[PDB]
Amino acid sequence: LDRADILYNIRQTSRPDVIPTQRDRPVAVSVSLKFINILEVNEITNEVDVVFWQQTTWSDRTLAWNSSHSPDQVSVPISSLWVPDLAAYNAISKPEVLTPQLAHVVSDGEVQYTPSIRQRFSCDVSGVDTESGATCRIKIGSWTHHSREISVDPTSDDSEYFSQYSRFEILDVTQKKNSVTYSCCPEAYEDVEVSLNFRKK
Amino acid sequence: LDRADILYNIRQTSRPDVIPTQRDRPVAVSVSLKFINILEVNEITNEVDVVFWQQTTWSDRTLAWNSSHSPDQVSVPISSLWVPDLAAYNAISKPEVLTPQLAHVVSDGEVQYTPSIRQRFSCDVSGVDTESGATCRIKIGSWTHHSREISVDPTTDSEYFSQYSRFEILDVTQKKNSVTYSCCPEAYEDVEVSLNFRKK
Amino acid sequence: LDRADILYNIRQTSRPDVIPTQRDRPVAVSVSLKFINILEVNEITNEVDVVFWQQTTWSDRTLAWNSSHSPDQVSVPISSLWVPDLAAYNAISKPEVLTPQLAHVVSDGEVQYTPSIRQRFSCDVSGVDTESGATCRIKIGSWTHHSREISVDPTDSEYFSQYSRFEILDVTQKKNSVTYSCCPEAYEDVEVSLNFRKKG
Amino acid sequence: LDRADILYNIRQTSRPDVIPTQRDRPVAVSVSLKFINILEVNEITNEVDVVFWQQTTWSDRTLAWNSSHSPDQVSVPISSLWVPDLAAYNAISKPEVLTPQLAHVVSDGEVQYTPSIRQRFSCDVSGVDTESGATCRIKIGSWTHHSREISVDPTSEYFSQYSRFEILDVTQKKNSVTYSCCPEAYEDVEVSLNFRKKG
Amino acid sequence: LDRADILYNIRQTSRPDVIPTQRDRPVAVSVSLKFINILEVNEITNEVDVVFWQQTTWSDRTLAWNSSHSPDQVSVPISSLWVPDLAAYNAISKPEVLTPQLAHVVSDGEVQYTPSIRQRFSCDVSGVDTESGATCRIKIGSWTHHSREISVDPTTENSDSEYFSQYSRFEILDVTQKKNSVTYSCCPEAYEDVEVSLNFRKKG
Ligand SMILES: CCOc1cncc(N2CCCNCC2)c1
Ligand SMILES: CCOc1cncc(N2CCCNCC2)c1
Ligand SMILES: CCOc1cncc(N2CCCNCC2)c1
Ligand SMILES: CCOc1cncc(N2CCCNCC2)c1
Ligand SMILES: CCOc1cncc(N2CCCNCC2)c1
Ligand SMILES: *[C@@H]1O[C@H](CO)[C@@H](O)[C@H](O)[C@H]1NC(C)=O
């Protein structure tokens, strides 16, 4: 098998529609935000403009191949793969995807998709000009799949890729997992809450 | 049947251009708005910016399957389904869809599509800075189908409204209208949603 | 015939790129604007922002069917139909289509497409803050088809928003036939005169 | 042949990806701008907002038919035709196309595509509020085809009375430029627009 | 072979999704930015608006043909070719592509794709109103391919203000390029990028 052969098979048999559940177990999706920039803060209206990498990881055995005398990885356009339907519950603009829309696929079936995203959010901005900073929370989860179909789980150094040229600095980043029951359905929907503690320089 | 088989059948036989009428009764569509945020109010020009979930529900027996040893639900890209042509009559911008465009389908043929939408409207904003608040009405209905083809009905408040908004919701009421336009002798149903809100 | 059958036939044989001329006669297109809102006026730069329904009507016998024991109308995505190539000559932005893009088709071949459109224009705005108002003209016609291929013909506050900062005093329509420097053929258009002013 | 037949044949055989060279001679493209409006001038940053028709004309024998008992013209969606890859070198926004994207095709193979375009440019704006006016130049040419594949050549009438500005004069000239990347020459047309603020 | 034949073969056999590696080696991509304009500078927020040509060059033998009595070049829509997945790491808006999306292909398999792009960046703007100017760096590299799959390198050749607009409010003092090889926290592989340093100031 060469790369040409693998990508060919993937294009033909992939099923981008079909969630890769294994035996009535959820697909375990890991989500991690790497903050890159903080752009436009408004303490009056409680809105922020963030740039971050949304590192997303899951398993899809449908994609697997024998990597014996073969490449053990390929890059695949996301249009040819199933992808989790994650959304930011407190976003007030649609995600603007800055980078090429390719996913990394390893021969075992492990997929990683890490787009860079600029997005505007609604959160608590009070104290941004204070020594203790503001704490903004971002809630991310599956939009249509409940806890028995998709589970989201958190995966560091906050500022590792954070821009030195931003007008702001990161004090701390914490992650926690929630399981919420909405008024519509009897099933639970998991999400990850990412708390970003930051202030003006 | 597994999910792969169901989604396959749906993709092949769905007929997204064809309204799923049953013996010449209307398709009963339910509409419900869940307000999430209020963003940019202008009392001078009478314009608001709202973010809301537009929960939409109807029945399409064409999609049904027998689920004896089978999943009883799947998520389907809306491009593969018939979807009601609802529009907001007093919208002054096109809907900006914030979420993935998937619908939930249950084995009986029940469909639910609930996108999160940011949209700008033209409505009565006067008194927004008052203890009694402004009351903005949003009128939503089918754009091309009359009352014998599609009927819209409200469902039988700040539950998801943002605590960080500059505004707060006082009350939300729903009522149904049946209107005859100058163009046609048929009636067109819509739902009017009254949003009572003020500045904090 | 049921709806499923008719929409199927239309999808297979419609020919969206082929103008439905009959025996060398122009397709007769009727155009009517229903004003919904006036949004952003600038008397300095002579620019207005209008929201209107662009009601467009014509005949296409290719789409006809026997409605004996059948539906006499269906809704069709405009991507599956020929549609006239109308443009606003004095528009300074592209049309923003607010509604679902469906046309109404009747069994005789009559098509009606009425999208709601927000668009910015360049026109005479002087006297907008006066008792007699400004008169803005909008010129709409076929972009590439001359008078022997497409003819356009005309058909106030009825659907105008009470919450606009402006009010409509009068709307008049007239038809022009213009010869451009490029070609010896005449191109028809409709000119719609909108007389409006600021309230209070 | 009727219109239905012609449009059918065109859809099946057109080859939009293939430049219609004849005997390895350039395709001769004619370009003409008709100014419709001038919208947002900034003398400080040297930027203007223009609305103009970009009248573009060339020949493609692949599209020809016998007109003998037939129509001699049809309208064709540009997605079904080869079209020249013209670009404005000093544009600072992408073209916003205001009109339906149809080209006019005559039975001999002559094509005309005239979209109305709103675009923002970077040019000399100084003296816009002066009796002699500013002179803004717009440079338009093929982006990827050199002078042996595509040649471009020049060819208030529709200008808005309601603009805050007026046109004093419009001149056209042709340039042939060699860039640092390739040994071939690339043709373009430079359109000089002399305009000022009204009084 | 005529143009029609070559473009036909390319459309049928091209493989846009398959990186054209040769015998286990990186695809060598060359990158060069030609600055055309500087538009909106904000020293307070450290943001600039740039227009530049992004000249990108690589080799794909899959596209080659015998040019013995034939054309030696064609223009191809990028949708029918493999293209390197380059991204600007400090961009804060998506690239706005100003030009037709065609690539130049030579019979040997050499491809050149040079779009004109308007983009907003986050960089050091301090001293823009000073005689010595600001120095803004732009970091460009492959988003998903590591150093053994794609290598990026600055162009060997020499040349800046060559296509820079005389009508900009700003002027270019100098442009330097250097290559970096970075290891990220996610993977054990190295990712190459090019860093382009743009020294510029406001005109007097
Ligand atoms: C019947 C469940 O179908 C649905 C379709 N789209 C969205 C939702 N939502 C509620 C579940 C959790 N996500 C928020 C929206 C539910
Ligand atoms: C008879 C159906 O013809 C029509 C085609 N498009 C829109 C409408 N409208 C009138 C009905 C209510 N919706 C707004 C416009 C009617
Ligand atoms: C030579 C006729 O072909 C044409 C191709 N595109 C546009 C036009 N127009 C001139 C007629 C009126 N509409 C504006 C542009 C004509
Ligand atoms: C080998 C020529 O390939 C090219 C691919 N893209 C753009 C250009 N340009 C330089 C030629 C003149 N036009 C500007 C763009 C050249
Ligand atoms: C495990 C490698 O998979 C990946 C999939 N998408 C993006 C990245 N990135 C990290 C490597 C350097 N480029 C930035 C994004 C990595
Ligand atoms: C290229 O073309 C000529 C004849 O038309 C031929 O002699 C030559 O061998 C060909 N080269 C190849 C296939 O490498």
Tab-separated table of C-alpha atoms and ligand atoms in Angstrom, chain A residues 89 141-145 180 182 184-185 189, chain B residues 53 55 73 75 99-100 102-106 111-115 160, ligand 1:
chain	number	residue	atom	x	y	z
A	89	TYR	CA	-23.005	27.172	23.249
A	141	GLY	CA	-20.305	19.952	23.196
A	142	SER	CA	-22.126	17.769	20.662
A	143	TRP	CA	-25.161	19.531	19.183
A	144	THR	CA	-27.292	16.502	18.252
A	145	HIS	CA	-25.726	13.441	19.876
A	180	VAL	CA	-26.695	18.360	31.134
A	182	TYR	CA	-32.323	19.742	28.455
A	184	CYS	CA	-36.469	18.748	25.054
A	185	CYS	CA	-35.221	15.147	25.703
A	189	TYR	CA	-25.702	15.737	26.658
B	53	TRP	CA	-32.719	28.405	19.011
B	55	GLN	CA	-36.819	24.450	17.483
B	73	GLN	CA	-32.743	7.498	16.087
B	75	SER	CA	-28.684	12.369	12.831
B	99	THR	CA	-24.559	25.363	14.599
B	100	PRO	CA	-23.974	22.182	12.530
B	102	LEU	CA	-28.121	18.264	11.266
B	103	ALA	CA	-31.644	17.085	12.024
B	104	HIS	CA	-32.680	14.446	14.565
B	105	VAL	CA	-34.794	11.612	13.093
B	106	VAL	CA	-36.677	9.022	15.144
B	111	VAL	CA	-38.004	15.015	12.714
B	112	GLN	CA	-36.571	17.787	14.879
B	113	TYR	CA	-34.299	20.537	13.572
B	114	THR	CA	-33.051	23.076	16.104
B	115	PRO	CA	-30.402	25.438	14.736
B	160	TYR	CA	-31.119	29.387	28.414
F	1	LIG	C1	-34.649	15.691	19.691
F	1	LIG	C2	-33.200	16.159	19.810
F	1	LIG	O1	-32.864	16.895	18.630
F	1	LIG	C3	-32.068	18.033	18.711
F	1	LIG	C4	-31.614	18.607	17.508
F	1	LIG	N1	-30.835	19.693	17.438
F	1	LIG	C5	-30.454	20.286	18.583
F	1	LIG	C6	-30.823	19.828	19.876
F	1	LIG	N2	-30.408	20.467	21.010
F	1	LIG	C7	-30.728	19.991	22.373
F	1	LIG	C8	-29.749	18.869	22.744
F	1	LIG	C9	-28.393	19.439	23.195
F	1	LIG	N3	-27.836	20.403	22.207
F	1	LIG	C10	-28.496	21.719	22.078
F	1	LIG	C11	-29.585	21.707	20.992
F	1	LIG	C12	-31.658	18.670	19.920
